[PDB]
């Protein structure tokens, strides 16, 4: 598996709401911080990472770990204060924390029967 | 099939424009109205329903009907007056009616040959 | 994906010879060190890790990351000084380093044509 910009490798995600924060965690083991990039653009968060390809002159006996470009885009709802995103990378897990900023007097749709 | 929040069961959809209204219908048989929730957030409508799991102490001879959490999200175009959504549930069909509110002087892209 | 002892989750591996050392690296993100166990038994190295299941009372919106028991067994050749294995865990990567201890006067099989 070698991810490219046009066909990125995907990384698995857990996402959950923790009270007033929305949290997303990605398994992104073995990434150098120079690679990690988090782009925010209105409601959309894009995570991009790279793991370099193995030296072509190196004979691997096993080479199962995914390499190249990783990318995933999250479309967040309007109540997420994307501007206040906090990001951390530890133990090979990229964790994003976005505050939830509920609008006042939210719509509640009733269903007719 | 048991749908969860993280892996919802999906329900089939018909959607069509009827003059000045956009209509969406979902097959959602056997849902108690207490379960149905329709969330609107800017242009996105999210439909959520639950059908309870069968009593674990009940021996079913057939149990093919999907149970648990159903969810589907619709990304609507800007001309849809989502604030004026009307929703009804009858005969196991959830019907949504969204008025279409065309903007003035819409762009018409011409193609060069 | 929930790995058990009888059906462990598998983790990807790179393995290569680096001069006088054999190196194996595993992607094992988000493991607490209390979980990691490396058992050596003659020529066989077994790696075992656990990632706890999500609290059943927690509603996840996405839960793609593999959880439960991870395990992989490596059958190493006789020239690997398994007794002198060195193991490290950083950035979610479990790295094993085994010294290579070549026997004297190794057999070289010639092929008749």
């Amino acid at each position: 598996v070698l991810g490219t910009s046009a066909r990125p490798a995907v990384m698995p995600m857990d996402a959950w709401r923790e009270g007033d924060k929305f949290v997303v965690e990605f398994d992104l083991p073995g990434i150098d911080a120079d690679s990690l990039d988090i782009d925010i653009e209105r409601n959309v968060v894009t995570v991009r990472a790279e793991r370099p390809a193995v030296d072509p002159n190196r004979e691997m006996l096993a080479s199962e770990r995914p390499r190249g470009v990783f990318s995933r885009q999250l479309v967040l709802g309007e109540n997420l204060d994307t501007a206040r995103i906090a990001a951390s990378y530890t133990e090979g897990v990229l964790k994003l924390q976005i505050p939830v900023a509920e609008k006042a007097k939210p719509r509640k749709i009733s269903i007719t029967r | 099939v048991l749908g969860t929040s993280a892996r919802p069961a999906v329900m089939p959809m018909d959607a069509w424009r009827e003059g000045d209204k956009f209509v969406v219908e979902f097959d959602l048989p056997g849902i108690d109205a207490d379960s149905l929730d329709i969330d609107i957030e800017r242009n996105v409508v999210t439909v959520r329903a639950e059908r309870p799991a069968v009593d674990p102490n009940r021996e079913m001879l057939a149990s093919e009907r999907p149970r648990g959490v159903f969810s589907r999200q619709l990304v609507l175009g800007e001309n849809l007056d989502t604030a004026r959504i009307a929703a009804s549930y009858t005969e196991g069909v959830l019907k949504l009616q969204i008025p279409v509110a065309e903007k003035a002087k819409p762009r018409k892209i011409s193609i060069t040959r | 994906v929930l790995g058990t002892s009888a059906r462990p989750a598998v983790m990807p591996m790179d393995a290569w010879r680096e001069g006088d050392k054999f190196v194996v690296e595993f992607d094992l993100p988000g493991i607490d060190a209390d979980s990691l166990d490396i058992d050596i038994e003659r020529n066989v190295v077994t790696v075992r890790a656990e990632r706890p299941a999500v609290d059943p009372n927690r509603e996840m919106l996405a839960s793609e990351r593999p959880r439960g028991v991870f395990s992989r067994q490596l059958v190493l050749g006789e020239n690997l000084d398994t007794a002198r294995i060195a193991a490290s865990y950083t950035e979610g990567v479990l790295k094993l380093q085994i010294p290579v201890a070549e026997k004297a006067k190794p057999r070289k099989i010639s092929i008749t044509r």
Binding site: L74, V75, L76, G77, L80 | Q73 | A62
Partner: peptide
């Protein structure tokens, strides 16, 4: 905490 699948 809304997210689009």
């Amino acid at each position: 905490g809304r997210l689009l699948p």
